[PDB]
Structures are given as C-alpha cells and as structure tokens.
Write an enzyme that holds these catalytic residues in place. Structure first.
Site, PDB file in Angstrom:
ATOM      1  N   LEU A 122      16.797  -4.978  15.363  1.00  0.00           N
ATOM      2  CA  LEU A 122      18.173  -4.782  15.851  1.00  0.00           C
ATOM      3  C   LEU A 122      18.211  -4.929  17.365  1.00  0.00           C
ATOM      4  CD1 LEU A 122      19.415  -1.888  13.527  1.00  0.00           C
ATOM      5  CD2 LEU A 122      20.005  -4.302  13.312  1.00  0.00           C
ATOM      6  N   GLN A 176      11.289  -2.206  10.448  1.00  0.00           N
ATOM      7  CA  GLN A 176      10.843  -3.588  10.662  1.00  0.00           C
ATOM      8  C   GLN A 176       9.710  -3.754  11.675  1.00  0.00           C
ATOM      9  OE1 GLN A 176      14.734  -6.398   9.505  1.00  0.00           O
ATOM     10  NE2 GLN A 176      14.317  -5.925  11.656  1.00  0.00           N
ATOM     11  N   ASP A 206      25.212  15.246  11.151  1.00  0.00           N
ATOM     12  CA  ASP A 206      24.861  13.826  11.179  1.00  0.00           C
ATOM     13  C   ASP A 206      25.309  13.175   9.869  1.00  0.00           C
ATOM     14  OD1 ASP A 206      23.687  11.289  11.175  1.00  0.00           O
ATOM     15  OD2 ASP A 206      21.764  11.985  11.946  1.00  0.00           O
ATOM     16  N   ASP A 255      16.046   9.867  10.953  1.00  0.00           N
ATOM     17  CA  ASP A 255      15.521  11.057  11.635  1.00  0.00           C
ATOM     18  C   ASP A 255      14.241  10.781  12.421  1.00  0.00           C
ATOM     19  OD1 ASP A 255      17.477  12.908  10.766  1.00  0.00           O
ATOM     20  OD2 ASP A 255      16.387  13.275   8.903  1.00  0.00           O
ATOM     21  N   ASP A 270      10.835  18.860  16.104  1.00  0.00           N
ATOM     22  CA  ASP A 270      10.759  18.165  17.383  1.00  0.00           C
ATOM     23  C   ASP A 270      10.200  16.764  17.145  1.00  0.00           C
ATOM     24  OD1 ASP A 270      10.478  17.313  20.012  1.00  0.00           O
ATOM     25  OD2 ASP A 270       9.507  19.158  20.700  1.00  0.00           O
TER      26      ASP A 270
HETATM   27 CA   LIG Z   1      19.554  12.456  11.508  1.00  0.00          CA
END
Ligand SMILES: [Ca+2]
Ligand SMILES: [Ca+2]
Length: 284
Positions: free
Chosen positions: A12, A79, A210, A253, A267
């Site tokens: 991307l 990727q 999210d 994530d 973290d």
């Molecule tokens: Ca997330």
C-alpha cells in the site's frame, strides 16, 4: 544500535497519503528513539509479490548507496515479508535479516474466499454480504469513506499464488505445517512473529473504539484454520525462527492500528523495539 539499518516493509504505497499517518503506526518513531537508523519501504499493493520484490530491491540498492551500509534488517508485515524474502533469496549478501510479522507466507484463506466471491463460485449470498461489508468497514475506517476493489491487493495473497511464490523462493519456510524454518539460510537470518484473535469481543479494551476489529472478527469465522488474525492463519505466518505468535491481536492490531487502538492494552510498539535490540544482540 543495530549494525545494519532497519527497513520497515509493507504493501500500500498510497497508505500514508490517503490515511494521513504511517502504516506502521508510531513504530519508526519509537525505533529511532532507541538509536536505530530506520527507513520505510511502501510497496505497490495491486500487483505480484515478485513485482514488490523488484521494487524493494531498487529501494534497497538506493538506500545502501546512501548509507554505505552493506546490509539491511527487513521488518515486514502482511505483503511485506514476501517482498523481503524475494530480496533475501536473490541478493542474500545485501540482507542481514528478514523478520516476518503476520506475513502471508503460505497464503490467505480470506483471499481465497474473496476470489470465489469474485468468480461467483457458488458462495451463498449471506456470506458474500458479510465478507464484503467487513472489507468495506475496514477500508472506510482508514480512507474515511467499493469493497470489491480490495481484490486487487488480495489477488497475490491466495493460497495458490503464494504456493507458487514459495516454490520459487522456499528459503526458511517450515518443513512441517505450524513448525519453524531454519534461522539462517544463505547467511541471512529469518525470524517470525504472529498473532491470532482470542477471547470474546467485550474484553478487547482499546479495540472497542476501533471499527476494524469487529470486521476482522467476522472474516475470522470463515477460516478453516481456527487460529487466525482475520486475514491469515497462524500456521501460514511461519517463517524461520519463531519469536512469539500468541498475541491476542488481529492483522491490523500488529502494526498498532487503527492509530494505536489495539487489543487488551498490549504494547504493540514494544514488540518492535525489543526485537530491534534482539537483532543488535545478534551482531545485526
Ligand atoms: Ca485495532
Ligand atoms: Ca506472486
């Protein structure tokens, strides 16, 4: 602190421009605070792994000239690791290490399903809608506002396509499914990280805000491999020496997205900074 510069690798090319922040959210910043020299290679999503591989080689050639370093430490996601493997296979003397983080090293089951949907291969309508709505939600969250256009990126990540890639570039792949590959092949060190979605959604802490996480959980249900991050199965991520792959995190994530909203107050940035110190300790 690492001998060789770190190169973050992802697909991307237009991510940062369109989304307004980096694909590896806050990770290059953190690594530079620990004294590492860091660069990001943003490769062309809508093409083959080999094309991204050639792209990355050109990037690395120009970078090595500019740094006078002899090698690079690749840290790739999705990727990214396949392009890194291409460069390591073909130009091993220019690669100190390949670190794969949730890489599609043996193909993506959801990419397979997406191709069946596109080919109209007897997929019931209720599944078609669930899959397309999930991808639409993911794309819209990042871009701000079509989901069938995402096949352009997934075309090169099907099991069939990656199997063909693996045939050409077998280095460091595990000999047994769900196992580990050789740590050192042709002088290049190979490491892998991974994750899979775990627990009921209610306890996901930061991910509740999210919108991409619920969508990844939808996609997760369509895998035959039960342990998956919503885009790739746990076993498919494996390359070289395993470091850790039981993080309770989805595909997104693991690059600290969206904008630091992750699962269970983990973290994510620390995964990268600790690994950079680990590379430095291996004289890389
Ligand atoms: Ca997330
Ligand atoms: Ca390919």
């Amino acid at each position: 602190s690492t001998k060789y510069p770190i190169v973050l690798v992802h697909g991307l090319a237009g991510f940062n421009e369109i989304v307004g922040f980096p694909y590896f959210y806050g990770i290059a910043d953190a690594l530079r605070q620990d004294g590492h020299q860091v660069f990001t290679a943003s490769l062309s999503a809508f093409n083959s792994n080999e094309v991204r591989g050639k792209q990355l080689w050109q990037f690395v050639q120009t970078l090595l000239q500019e740094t006078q370093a002899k090698k690079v430490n690749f840290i790739g996601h999705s990727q990214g690791p396949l392009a890194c493997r291409y460069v390591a296979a073909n130009y091993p003397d220019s690669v100190a290490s390949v670190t794969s983080i949730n890489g599609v090293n043996h193909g993506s089951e959801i990419a397979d399903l997406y191709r069946r949907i596109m080919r109209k291969d007897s997929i019931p309508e209720y599944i078609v809608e669930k899959v397309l709505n999930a991808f639409g939600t993911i794309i819209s969250t990042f871009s701000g506002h079509d989901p069938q256009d995402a096949i352009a990126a997934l075309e090169s990540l099907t099991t069939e396509q990656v199997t063909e890639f693996n045939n050409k570039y077998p280095q460091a792949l595990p000999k047994t499914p769900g196992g580990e590959g050789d740590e050192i092949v042709n002088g290049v060190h190979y490491y892998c990280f991974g994750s899979y979605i775990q627990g009921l959604i209610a306890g996901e802490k930061g991910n509740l805000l999210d919108p991409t996480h619920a969508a990844m959980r939808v996609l997760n249900t369509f895998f035959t491999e039960k342990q998956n991050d919503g885009l790739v199965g746990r076993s498919s991520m494996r390359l070289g020496k395993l470091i850790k792959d039981d993080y309770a995190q989805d595909h997104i994530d693991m690059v600290n997205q969206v904008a630091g909203l992750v699962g269970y107050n983990e973290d994510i940035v620390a995964i990268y900074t600790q690994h950079a110190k680990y590379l430095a300790s291996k004289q890389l």
